[PDB]
Amino acid sequence: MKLKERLAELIPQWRAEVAEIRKKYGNRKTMDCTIGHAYGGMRGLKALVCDTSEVFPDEGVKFRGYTIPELREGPHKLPTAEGGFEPLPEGLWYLLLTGELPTEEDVKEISAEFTKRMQNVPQYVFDVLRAMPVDTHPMTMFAAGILAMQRESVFAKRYEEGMRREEHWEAMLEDSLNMLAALPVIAAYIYRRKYKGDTHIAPDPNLDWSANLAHMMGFDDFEVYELFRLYMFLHSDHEGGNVSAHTNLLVNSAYSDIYRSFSAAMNGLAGPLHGLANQEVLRWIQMLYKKFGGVPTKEQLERFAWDTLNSGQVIPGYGHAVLRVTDPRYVAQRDFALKHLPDDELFKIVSLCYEVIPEVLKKHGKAKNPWPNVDAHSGVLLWHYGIREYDFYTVLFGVSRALGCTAQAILVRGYMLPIERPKSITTRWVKEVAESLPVAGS
Amino acid sequence: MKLKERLAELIPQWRAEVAEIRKKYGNRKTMDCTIGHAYGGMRGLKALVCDTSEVFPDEGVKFRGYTIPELREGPHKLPTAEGGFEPLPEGLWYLLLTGELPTEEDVKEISAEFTKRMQNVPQYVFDVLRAMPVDTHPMTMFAAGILAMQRESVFAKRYEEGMRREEHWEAMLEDSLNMLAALPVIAAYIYRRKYKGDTHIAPDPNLDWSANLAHMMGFDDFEVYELFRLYMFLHSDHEGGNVSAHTNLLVNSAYSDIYRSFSAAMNGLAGPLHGLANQEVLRWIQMLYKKFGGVPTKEQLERFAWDTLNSGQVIPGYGHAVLRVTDPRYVAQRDFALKHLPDDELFKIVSLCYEVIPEVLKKHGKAKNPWPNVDAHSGVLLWHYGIREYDFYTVLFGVSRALGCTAQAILVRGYMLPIERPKSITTRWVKEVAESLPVAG
Amino acid sequence: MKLKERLAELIPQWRAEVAEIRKKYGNRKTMDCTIGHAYGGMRGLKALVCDTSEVFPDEGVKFRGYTIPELREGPHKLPTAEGGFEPLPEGLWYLLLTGELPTEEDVKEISAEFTKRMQNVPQYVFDVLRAMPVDTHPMTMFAAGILAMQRESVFAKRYEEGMRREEHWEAMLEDSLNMLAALPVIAAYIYRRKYKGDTHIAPDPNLDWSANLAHMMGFDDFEVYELFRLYMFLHSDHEGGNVSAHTNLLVNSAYSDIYRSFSAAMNGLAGPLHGLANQEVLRWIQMLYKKFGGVPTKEQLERFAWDTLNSGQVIPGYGHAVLRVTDPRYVAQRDFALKHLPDDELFKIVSLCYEVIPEVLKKHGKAKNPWPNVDAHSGVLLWHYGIREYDFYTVLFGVSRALGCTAQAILVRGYMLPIERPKSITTRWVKEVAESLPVA
Amino acid sequence: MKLKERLAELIPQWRAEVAEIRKKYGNRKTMDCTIGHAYGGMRGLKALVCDTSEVFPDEGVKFRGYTIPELREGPHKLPTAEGGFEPLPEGLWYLLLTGELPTEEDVKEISAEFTKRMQNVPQYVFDVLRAMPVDTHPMTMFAAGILAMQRESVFAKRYEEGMRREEHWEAMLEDSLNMLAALPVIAAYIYRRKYKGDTHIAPDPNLDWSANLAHMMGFDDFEVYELFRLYMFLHSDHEGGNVSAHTNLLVNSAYSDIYRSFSAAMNGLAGPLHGLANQEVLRWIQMLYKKFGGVPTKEQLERFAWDTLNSGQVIPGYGHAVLRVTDPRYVAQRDFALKHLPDDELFKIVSLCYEVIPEVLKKHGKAKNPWPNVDAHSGVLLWHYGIREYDFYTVLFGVSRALGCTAQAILVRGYMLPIERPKSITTRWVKEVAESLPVAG
Ligand SMILES: CC(=O)SCCNC(=O)CCNC(=O)[C@H](O)C(C)(C)COP(=O)(O)OP(=O)(O)OC[C@H]1O[C@@H](n2cnc3c(N)ncnc32)[C@H](O)[C@@H]1OP(=O)(O)O
Ligand SMILES: CC(C)(COP(=O)(O)OP(=O)(O)OC[C@H]1O[C@@H](n2cnc3c(N)ncnc32)[C@H](O)[C@@H]1OP(=O)(O)O)[C@@H](O)C(=O)NCCC(=O)NCCS
Ligand SMILES: O=C([O-])CC(=O)C(=O)O
Ligand SMILES: O=C([O-])CC(=O)C(=O)O
Ligand SMILES: O=C([O-])CC(=O)C(=O)O
């Protein structure tokens, strides 16, 4: 498999380079660590490594150096499905792992690997899923189902039998192949059992990964396959500092396998502060629609935005700190709606918003960035094609972000990064010492 | 419950204090952040707040200011079971939450809440546990059963009903009582199914929390109860920077409830680098006894230690970097053995090790610490009484450590600390800019 | 446990005696092995060892030298339940193992050990039984339940860890205590699921083993407790050579643990020539009662007996492989019935058969034994007290016969007897050499 | 089906021949019965009839007069798979029942019958299997599933309804066909659940019986299919007197159906001294290999054999109750290894064992047969092809041995042999009487 033969060459180089970076430049200072950082969620503190994606506050997130547009269209385009436009997550994943663009064949090998292993979800994983009351939240069911599959972990097995640190990444790749293949199956199982009368649709062995997720949920239109593919591409990764990506690295750092690290990560993604934005945006949009008995005019939408902001509320999906431009992930999805559903009422509102809202956020002047993010666009897309089960949206997210998390975990284990072990401090000590302490600088 | 009425008075005070500390001293620098932290798992980086316990290099861990001697023996001794000597975790928990020492009444209220609530483990939790093949690792079973119980989360439900941040700690507390009550039942269920022929022993409503775990695992000797109480006490908390306590805090920072954070924390505990040390020690002691056909002499042990150190190995249970004195958690456990099982042979090796290994580690001069930690003593105690299922040792650990994780989670949600969102950096950026960075100093 | 302390003395002794026998007398001839033996199910062949019991053609079974009357009536009467008359099987089991008569206190130890270990049937055993469809034959359910419990086998675990032959008996004893405690629980569960609407009754912790089976099956009655005690006493053991006992020895001889060897045995007891006769007697008694609208005359019964034989059938409950006199196991149940239900009409038919059928069978002139065996009497007792689930009768048998199976397997492992592996022969060889062989 | 048409003529002939023999040659003496026989496991005592096969002390097994070479290569080579070399068990079975060598067409009739009925394993058997904890030994799982399926016995249903003794062999044949079809499915379910992540592969209707078992286990190489064919053939049958065959006859004799008689026989095969030796052989080789970190010297193996003897353990894979020479089932398997895997490490240890272990057992002086048996060789063959789960090896044996068990049960109910019921004797009797008894010569 190209993906592995390649990683067999690159990872020992990278390991040597990281060893060199630690020895030679370990003592280079990047910043001051303050009291503020400890009480402030480490916000700003350069504490983590991640090589799969990087946010440039001018341009947006980039995957191994490449912009999102570049990878969606033009000579840098990632391989599609036969007769498709949208880039397959399978090829995206190859990129995150190798830093290199995959060929057509490279991607067909990953799709085949995911397809073959998609048949190897253990029966007991379903037994476990069926044991959970049906009204359990989908993110609980999802994480639990992932965790139960831990019995099949090749990393745990091999760790216990005795394996060199040099082989960690190989076992992590093998487990990641297995778990990634499992996720559409588990997710679909949950979807079907909760929402669609407990009727189960098997994988089609001719579909790519994302499309199979759609097929197994019960959607077979070409457009939905294309949506799923795009969705999975865009949401795959976003640095390592978000709660879910961080949890993954943290639990991985103790040599806990991907089933443990990833399911932990999902427990994190399930949190209301990490995993709900998509849904809140959508719910808002639909409230607008109900309020104005249809699409509002440019004027009505300005009047509403002003009243929202003046009673101290936020406009969902707009105005998050890190960027200073429009999220490429938003732009990609706008592009998709304009092509395949331009006359959708709820999307018209989203389109009106893209025109109005940043003009209102600029003249209100409370947001240093007035532009939308990826979560501003996704909801209407799902809803249009009849995926209307808000709670489940976070599962879809989780399915995508496993691309990032597995790639990251394979790499840091390839690099042989040590256990994540910050130092906590007590308020007792803060109060003892704070006066004696230098201000940030000197 | 006094604990609640008390937290009602204290947590607003602590919330206002922490606001003030952030405003007035946020800009105070504690240390240099380096490349080395980012590629070194943040070793040393004062990035977290934990007010439940603190490690002093020259004394050991302290719980809310108080040493282990103070609480176990000393002038501030925590309430025991009737007839008992060892401190009840129920009172330690009270202390971790309030920073104040419990009365006998306070401990009984907590004991009584854990007992009542021990009857409220949903049937579906057992269904889930049973659906897992019996040869599944017990820490996977443990974390999965806890996670399944997420459906009963009061936090989760109240968050969606819409609730002020001001009330977070109350929901966290409620869930924390339910979960803690459930942990012994889940852990016992796993033990009985895997190791004891799938026969199930119900909670005794007259036993404290620790004892009930022993009871439900099928051990009713007073000494065993006393061991369980001590164990649960010693292992309850060790700062917030360790993987499990950190995982707990991290996932909690997203407003995920205690079942999600604690199950996640347990996935980290399951990690070979975090959860196995007392087993490794015990097997080490067990190998010595096999090798010398009994307790080695001073001289056999010294040779074997020097041989060990001269092939680049470490001696398990000894020579950890943070302490510079013997871990008081080790001392308390040695005190227990000397008193209750002094002729146990594996104990005799452990005790001999206490004399011999520090001397060999001083002479060898490589260790900045020649002394043992908790993990060097805990195995032979468990094994003495017939808890011999190595893999399950991490579950006992987990049960104890829930006392600390719950306390820390209740607290930081009282404080209303924000989400944990550090910044990641690229090797690409480091390789570019490293040469142009100042050196720390 | 006195039982163990005693076996700890006795088995080393017996093992040395058996060694001595094999060395000094191994080549001592007992009988001729013939072609009839090989094609005739080994009838008469002294091929096996059993020290628990011996079946005398002209006297009946003896348990370690002691007759049923000796142990039920006196002058060597075993301990009873408090206020009971019937011997407790706990006491019989003690005697089968040691060859010594138990004290009262020795029997309470065993009762208390069964009661304690009764609480230790694994949940997964029930899981297994519930997965069997409810119309499954109950002997199928029984053997499966026992076999599933093989996962808790101490012999199996210890064998793998490494143990010398001398230690086998101790592992066999531990498993036998666990399994024997389990059988009443498993039997009751099957009974209650099949026949009593799937409601389940726990062990009562102040009942002996036999009476706990009755209790858990739903019958709380002194006479019933007494019947079960007697029943379990009587079917306990009957030499080494019957199909169930022999199956147990055979599978045991390859170092398979008691769950394997006993479940195998129950597969054999489930067989129509070994375990169904109780039932066939009852049905035949009920047929008589229906035809003649009550208890028949001696004339009506004789006709019906002749009509049974002319239609090519056996008269059930009569005859035996080796017995040639009235089975003492029959007589003991006759005494029970005379005492507790002498006006019961089915019983009346059974009693009338005792006077009439032996004459019929003597004249018929085929049967080598014209007298009743145990199976002639058991059904009408069970039926009288409200146990009417015919197929389940063989389970009760199974629970009892466990007593002798456990004792024998423990002993033979104590002795360290080797694997049972006789030589087979072909019909081709026989045909070629038969003329040249000597006669016996 | 030719098989049945042929049995319908042959069995009445055999029935009558038997009846005549019982009548005419009942009192023919074959040998003396001794105290030795009663206390020595009947060793040598001609106490059973078997017509499928006969084990010669000095040559090993013959199936209906034919040797293994004769049927595998020799002038009377059984039909293979298309493009195959190894003989198919389907044809050996036809030989066992009829005494006649099958055609191509007769073997395809049986293969097709197995294939068709492979689909008819009830759902409840799989429910029973899953109800068992996954760490249950395979041989217990195998026996239990077989036993659960007793519900579908035609013989037990027809017996309960009233059926003549003459229709017995017919009901036994119908049941055997169904059960034999079931055993690969049942065996493969156990293999998959325990060892391959609880995913399940359906039968392939284009495969013969042995190959389909591999297929359903997860192994599809031709050489693997060939190994299974040879394996199922070699372990089919071995006289009446082996513990499994005899347990089957014993239970059969009370009119218990094949599901009861064969599950019973499997509880006997599971014994360390019987079929479980194929597992024990590999466990023993493993301990060897670990002790000397690789292929040991002659001296190291010598020392190792003796240490197992001196610790009161058996050396698995050597010895036999009738064999007094190297087992031709062994020689056959060696042949297979030399051809297919001559350089395998484990195979080298087995080859070494063939020189050394007989030498040890001669000097030790107790074994009547110092040479290897079938179970010495079988494990290494499977291990080579990636079937390394040695606890499963006795299940494969069982699937094969069902062939012999079914052939014998059908025949003996055709002959109408009676219940097996030898006489037991007491030790008390032996003491009193022994001095008076004649010495046998
Ligand atoms: C069932 C099958 O498929 S094949 C054979 C069984 N499988 C095994 O490899 C088990 C190991 N082998 C043995 O135990 C024996 O050879 C068996 C199982 C065949 C038993 O057969 P027996 O006829 O009782 O053996 P044999 O007549 O040689 O026994 C005489 C003595 O030799 C010993 N002996 C025989 N084979 C072995 C052996 N492989 N290792 C150690 N001791 C042995 C016996 O234990 C006995 O010792 P004892 O006098 O202290 O009781
Ligand atoms: C138990 C039993 C099967 C043993 O049979 P056995 O060892 O073959 O007995 P015998 O040596 O007395 O058999 C000789 C003949 O008498 C016949 N016979 C024996 N008992 C008989 C009976 N109760 N009714 C009719 N005929 C009988 C046999 O069928 C045989 O007939 P055959 O010569 O036509 O073949 C036999 O006595 C019998 O069939 N009994 C009835 C069933 C029963 O109640 N069994 C309980 C067993 S504890
Ligand atoms: O005891 C532990 O788990 C280690 C620990 O607390 C820490 O390093 O902070
Ligand atoms: O003894 C026999 O063979 C038949 C019998 O009565 C029994 O097994 O109890
Ligand atoms: O064990 C026996 O006696 C004969 C046999 O099956 C065997 O070698 O498998």
The DSSP string of A43-105 is TT-EEEE--SEEEETTTEEEETTB-HHHHHSSTTPPP--TT--SPPHHHHHHHHHHSS---HH
Chain centroid to CA C65: 18
Q: For residue B78, what is the DSSP state?
A: P
C200 classed as catalytic: no
Q: Hey, whose CA ends up nearest to atom 7 of ligand 3? A: B242
Distance from CA of A129 to the nearest CA of D (A): 15
Would the CB atoms of D425 and C260 count as touching at under 8 Å? no
User: Which helix or strand (DSSP H or E) is residue B351 part of?
Assistant: helix B345-364
Chain C CB contacts of B388 below 8 Å: none
**Chain D neighbours among C 99-128 (CB < 8 Å)?**
124, 127-128
CB of D329 closer than 6 angstroms to any ligand 5 atom: no
Whether B388 contacts chain C with CB within 8 A: no
Interface test with D, best of B130, B132, B134 (most D CBs within 10 A): B134
Mutate to test the pocket of ligand 3, among B238, B243, B248, B378 (most ligand atoms within 8 A of CB): B238
B199 part of contact set with chain C, CB < 8 Å: yes
Contacts of D332 (CB under 8 A, 6+ apart): D68, D69, D72, D230, D234
Q: How far apart are CA D374 and CA D355, in angstroms?
A: 16
Retrieve residue B153's tokens. 């989360």
Q: CA A321 to CA D396: how far, in whole Å?
A: 65
CA–CA distance, D285 with D294 (Å, rounded to integer): 10
Q: Does the beta carbon of C115 sit less than 6 angstroms from any atom of ligand 4?
A: no
Please give the Cα distance from C314 to C357 (Å, whole number): 12
**Going by DSSP bridges, is the β-strand pair A46-49/A60-63 parallel, antiparallel, or unpaired?**
unpaired
Cis peptide upstream of residue C75 (ω within 30 degrees of 0): yes
Cβ neighbours of residue C275 closer than 8 Å, sequence gap 6 or more:
C139, C244, C268, C269, C394, C397, C398, D254
Q: How far is residue B364's CA from residue B359's CA, in Å, rounded to a whole number?
A: 9
Buried b (16+ CB within 10 A) or exposed e, C24-63: ebbebbbbbbbbbbbbbbbbbbbbbbbbbbbbeeeebbbb
Instruction: Please answer yes or no on whether C122 and B200 come within 8 Å at the CB atom.
Output: no
Q: For residues A153 and A149, what is the distance between their CA atoms, to the nearest angstrom?
A: 7
Of D193, D198, D199, which has the smallest distance from its Cβ to A119's Cβ?
D199
Among the bound ligands, name the one nearest to the CA of residue B278: 3
Nearest CA to ligand 3 atom 5: B242
Which two three-digit tokens encode residue B307? 């041989």
**The ligand 1 atom nearest the CA atom of D43:** 23
Residues 6+ apart with CB under 8 A from A54: A61, A62, A239, B426, B428, B429
Nearest CA in chain D to B135: D135
Q: Return d(Cα C38, Cα C32) in angstroms, integer.
A: 12
Which amino acid, one-letter code, is at A145?
G
Least Cα distance to D189 among D429, D395, D423 occurs for: D395
- Whether chain B has a CB inside 8 Å of the CB on D133: the answer is yes
Q: Is C254 on the interface with D (CB under 8 A)?
A: yes
Report residue C253: phi and psi, to 5°.
-70, -15
In the numeric block, which tokens belong to residue D121? 């394993």
As a whole number of angstroms, the distance between CA A110 and CA A290 comes to 45
Q: What are the tokens at B189?
A: 């269920």
D358 with D323: CB under 8 angstroms?
no
Handedness of CA D289, D292, D298, D304 (dihedral sign): negative
Q: Give residue D337 CA to ligand 1 midpoint distance, Å.
A: 25
CB pairs under 8 A between B and C: 14
List C-alpha distances in Å: B171 to A274, B185, B409, D125: 20, 22, 11, 47
Distance from the Cα of B421 to chain A's closest Cα (Å) equals: 5
What chain A residue is nearest to B432 in terms of C-alpha separation? Answer: A21
A185 touches chain D (CB under 8 A): no
Resolution (Å) of this entry: 2.3
| Residue where the block lists tokens 């006997």 | D268
Q: Is D156 touching C (CB cutoff 8 A)? A: yes
For testing the chain D interface, which of C10, C419, C432, C437 should be mutated: the one with the most D CBs within 10 Å? Answer: C419
Q: Give the active site residue among D274, D327, D377, D384.
A: D274
- Solved with: X-ray
Q: How many residues does chain B have?
A: 441
Helix, strand and coil in chain B, % to nearest 5: 60, 5, 30
- With beta carbons under 8 A apart, name residues in chain D contacting B193: 133
Kindly report the number of other CB atoms within 10 A of residue B431's CB atom: 13
From the CA of D393, which ligand is nearest?
Answer: 1
Q: In this structure, what token pair is assigned to residue D332? A: 């056959």
* Residues in contact with A93: Cβ distance below 8 Å, sequence separation at least 6, in sequence order: A110, A180, A236, A403, A406, A407
β-pairing verdict for D29-34 and C29-34: antiparallel
Query: For a pocket test of ligand 4, which of C54, C266, C320 has the largest count of ligand atoms closer than 8 A to its C-beta?
Result: C320
Residue C31 β-bridge partners = D33
Closest residue (by CA) to atom 3 of ligand 5? D242
Strands B60-63 and B53-56: antiparallel
Q: Is the CB of D321 under 6 A from ligand 5?
A: yes
* Spacing, Cα C359 to ligand 4 middle (Å): 23
Is A274 an annotated catalytic residue? yes
> CA geometry: angle at A34 spanning A28 and A35, to 5°?
150
Per annotation, catalytic residue among C168, C327, C375, C384? C375
Q: Which of A134, A138, A121 is nearest to A212 (CA)?
A: A121
By the 8 A CB rule, do D118 and D184 touch? yes
Instruction: Identify which ligand lies nearest to the alpha carbon of C321.
Output: 2
C-alpha pair distances (Å), B117 with each of B110, B182, B228: 11, 7, 20
Question: Cβ of A205 under 8 Å from any chain D Cβ?
Answer: no
Q: What are C125's two structure tokens? A: 């055993």
